[PDB]
Amino acid sequence: GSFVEMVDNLRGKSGQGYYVEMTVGSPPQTLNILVDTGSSNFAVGAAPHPFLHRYYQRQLSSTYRDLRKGVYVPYTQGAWAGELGTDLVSIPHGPNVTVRANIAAITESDKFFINGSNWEGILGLAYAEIARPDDSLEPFFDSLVKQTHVPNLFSLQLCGGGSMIIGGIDHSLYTGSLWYTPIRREWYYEVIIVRVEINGQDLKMDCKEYNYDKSIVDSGTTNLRLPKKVFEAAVKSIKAASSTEKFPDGFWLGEQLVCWQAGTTPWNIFPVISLYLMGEVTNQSFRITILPQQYLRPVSQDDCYKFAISQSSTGTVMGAVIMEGFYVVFDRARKRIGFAVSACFRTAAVEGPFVTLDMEDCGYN
Numbered sequence: 227g228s229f230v231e232m233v234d235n236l237r238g239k240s241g242q243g244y245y246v247e248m249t250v251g252s253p254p255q256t257l258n259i260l261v262d263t264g265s266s267n268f269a270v271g272a273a274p275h276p277f278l279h280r281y282y283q284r285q286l287s288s289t290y291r292d293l294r295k296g297v298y299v300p301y302t303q304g305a306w307a308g309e310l311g312t313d314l315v316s317i318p319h320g321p322n323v324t325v326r327a328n329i330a331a332i333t334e335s336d337k338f339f340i341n342g343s344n345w346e347g348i349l350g351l352a353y354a355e356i357a358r359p360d361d362s363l364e365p366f367f368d369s370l371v372k373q374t375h376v377p378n379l380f381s382l383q384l385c386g387g388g389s390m391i392i393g394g395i396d397h398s399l400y401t402g403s404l405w406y407t408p409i410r411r412e413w414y415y416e417v418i419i420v421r422v423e424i425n426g427q428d429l430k431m432d433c434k435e436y437n438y439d440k441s442i443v444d445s446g447t448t449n450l451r452l453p454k455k456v457f458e459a460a461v462k463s464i465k466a467a468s469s470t471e472k473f474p475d476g477f478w479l480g481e482q483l484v485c486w487q488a489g490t491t492p493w494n495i496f497p498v499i500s501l502y503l504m505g506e507v508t509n510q511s512f513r514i515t516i517l518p519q520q521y522l523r524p525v526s527q528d529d530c531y532k533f534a535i536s537q538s539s540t541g542t543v544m545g546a547v548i549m550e551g552f553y554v555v556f557d558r559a560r561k562r563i564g565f566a567v568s569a570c571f572r573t574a575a576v577e578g579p580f581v582t583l584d585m586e587d588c589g590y591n
């Protein structure tokens with residue numbers, strides 16, 4: 227494959243984030259940067275912190291330009307404050323280009339950096355609409371596309387480290403066909419879920435509930451996060467389908483873990499979950515099917531697991547444990563996201579087409 231040099235350019239895991247090396251400034255300062263499709267700011271630790279191995283030293287970069295404006299970014303989890311500027315940025319195991327990008331130098335933070343995660347900054351790959359301080363601060367990928375001929379597309383294979391292929395699709399990273407769902411709105415990577423099944427049994431909720439108040443794809447969130455009403459129905463259904471064994475109720479709430487003798491985890495007793503996504507043709511959908519190996523996240527002779535489906539008050543979030551099944555293509559150029567079975571008794575699947583009527587009615591307005 228022509229994209230071979232980008233294969234395996236990611237390290238990390240679902241619980242702590244996946245990261246890529248990025249080289250900033252002149253002379254080069256290389257840092258580990260969280261790959262985040264749920265936000266739109268590029269920002270790096272720029273001062274000592276207990277959880278940081280290295281940080282950006284602006285004074286040592288001759289190409290750094292201070293924008294003389296501060297920025298504050300609150301996330302679903304954590305927040306940071308810093309100073310805005312621009313500097314030269316390249317991705318050594320990514321595209322063969324160097325761009326002048328906005329960069330926020332993080333000087334203070336709260337509950338953001340994670341001990342032992344090995345990343346020192348964040349690459350927000352979503353759109354300008356959700357950038358801070360506002361949509362005038364051009365996100366990194368926008369600068370990349372504006373300043374270079376790199377195609378307006380990237381793809382993520384999260385294993386399952388992983389691969390971020392920038393500017394194309396690497397056919398070695400998936401099997402079968404790619405199936406595409408429209409990007410509903412260019413802010414988050416917003417999609418539309420049209421049906422949910424647990425072991426082939428329809429959850430039978432009004433599809434508007436699945437997307438209230440939005441459904442997004444976020445590589446920087448661990449879990450499948452669901453609106454409360456959906457979470458409740460899904461857990462009731464999963465519990466019923468896995469009755470071969472009994473689990474404490476707090477397990478389903480993430481307040482308890484269960485551990486099995488290494489190699490004895492009874493995967494076969496847990497159901498598969500299918501999420502149907504709106505397709506590219508009228509009344510057409512496809513499904514991605516999620517295994518217990520995905521939604522039971524590993525945390526001696528015992529293997530401990532946390533239930534990785536949880537509640538949200540801000541809509542559905544298809545996080546890393548969902549993406550780990552799949553090669554996911556963020557086709558910005560054609561405003562669509564593709565899913566295929568990742569090259570990394572049951573298997574994760576992407577299947578279609580299905581006939582689903584009134585799919586337009588599933589989205590929040």
Ligand SMILES: C[C@@H]1CCc2cccc(c2)C[C@@](C)(N)C(=O)OCc2cc(nc(N(C)S(C)(=O)=O)c2)CC1
Nearest residue numbers: 241242243264265301302303304446447448449536
């Ligand atoms: C991979 C994550 C680490 C990287 C990370 C930390 C903190 C913020 C972000 C990204 C940015 C953004 C935009 N991704 C964000 O705000 O995610 C919400 C989030 C993160 C995390 N857990 C969340 N959940 C509460 S859970 C356990 O249900 O998956 C939600 C921590 C794991």
